[PDB]
């Protein structure tokens, strides 16, 4: 288990402005160390991360009809790949 | 379970109302509502369509479902109840006094 | 409390004051009250170490009689409480 820590790429101009730099950010498992993120994306994209950042994202509360609702919580992680490499996968 | 009932996808007579006597192959059987689709009850829906995709949808008078009780299966002889006989191995269903 | 050879929980029971003659009549006035078991502490040597006993006054001898039975027992090595347990 290791492709379970990285969930999916975050799609935001803010996430995109990060590609210009060495900063690829994406959704990650809620219970996950910055350390275990490192080794996970490392061995998932054949690159080497230098610096990792993390946010929690309190799920916004949507609703439908008279039924109150609560979107699941999530964890952002933004990684700094060693100066001079890239993720063509994230580039698209 | 137990939701099973009369016939399936094949030839069937309609002893309903607006389409009494008529006969035809049942193109669909939805067990949830206990109704079957034949060729009888076909009403005109005016609706353009519920989904915006594909602009033209159809003022089509397509087939309307039908209570699975008003339709009866059939064989060489017209309109028959359904007995069941266990084969020499499996489990086939003979009609009122014939086979299949 | 009461636990020991004895095993006598203190029990509550009426203490009713009467006013009367006896060979003329007899009336009253009631209330509830708790009767405690006369129980004393009983220190005793027993092999090595010493050992006490929050025991009833009634069964005081029962202790000494039981200290005798203990002679026919093998015990040693730091056993303050444990003695009590193994002590029948």
């Amino acid at each position: 288990t290791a492709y379970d820590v990285i969930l999916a790429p975050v799609l935001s101009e803010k996430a995109y402005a990060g590609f210009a730099e060495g900063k690829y950010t994406f959704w990650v498992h809620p219970k996950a160390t910055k350390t275990e993120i490192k080794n996970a994306v490392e061995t998932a994209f054949k690159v080497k991360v230098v610096k990792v950042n993390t946010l929690h994202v309190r799920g916004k509360k949507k609703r439908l009809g008279r039924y109150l609702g609560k979107r699941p919580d999530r964890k952002k992680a933004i990684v700094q790949v060693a100066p001079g490499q890239k993720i063509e996968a994230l580039e698209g | 379970r137990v939701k099973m009932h009369v016939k399936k996808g094949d030839t069937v007579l309609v002893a309903s109302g607006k389409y009494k006597g008529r006969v035809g192959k049942v193109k669909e059987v939805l067990p949830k509502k206990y109704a079957v689709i034949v060729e009888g009850v076909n009403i005109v829906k005016k609706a353009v369509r519920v989904s915006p995709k594909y602009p033209q949808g159809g003022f089509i008078e397509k087939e309307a479902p039908l209570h699975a009780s008003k339709v009866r299966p059939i064989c060489p002889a017209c309109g028959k109840p359904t007995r069941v006989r266990k084969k020499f191995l499996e489990n086939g269903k003979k009609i009122r006094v014939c086979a299949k | 409390s009461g636990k020991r050879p004895i095993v006598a929980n203190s029990i509550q029971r009426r203490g009713k004051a009467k006013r009367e003659g006896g060979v003329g009549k007899k009336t009253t006035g009631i209330s509830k009250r708790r009767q405690y078991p006369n129980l004393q502490k009983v220190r005793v040597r027993v092999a090595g170490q010493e050992i006490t006993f929050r025991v009833a006054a009634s069964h005081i001898p029962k202790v000494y009689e039981l200290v005798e039975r203990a002679k026919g027992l093998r015990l040693e090595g730091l056993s303050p409480k444990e003695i009590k347990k193994e002590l029948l």
Binding site: T1, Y3, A8, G92 | - | -
Partner: protein
Amino acid sequence: MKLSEVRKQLEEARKLSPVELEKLVREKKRELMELRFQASIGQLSQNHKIRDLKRQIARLLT
């Protein structure tokens, strides 16, 4: 019907078994991520691929 298929493949996965189980799982796992990664972007996803792959993993895991 795909069941009878893959099942035998797994006791067939007894060349190295617990080891190839793990090797094979890790693989199917990546394919899964690669999948949902593309599924999120939209223009690289159909559908039944996921659940089929998800349950695929399960029986391997067994």
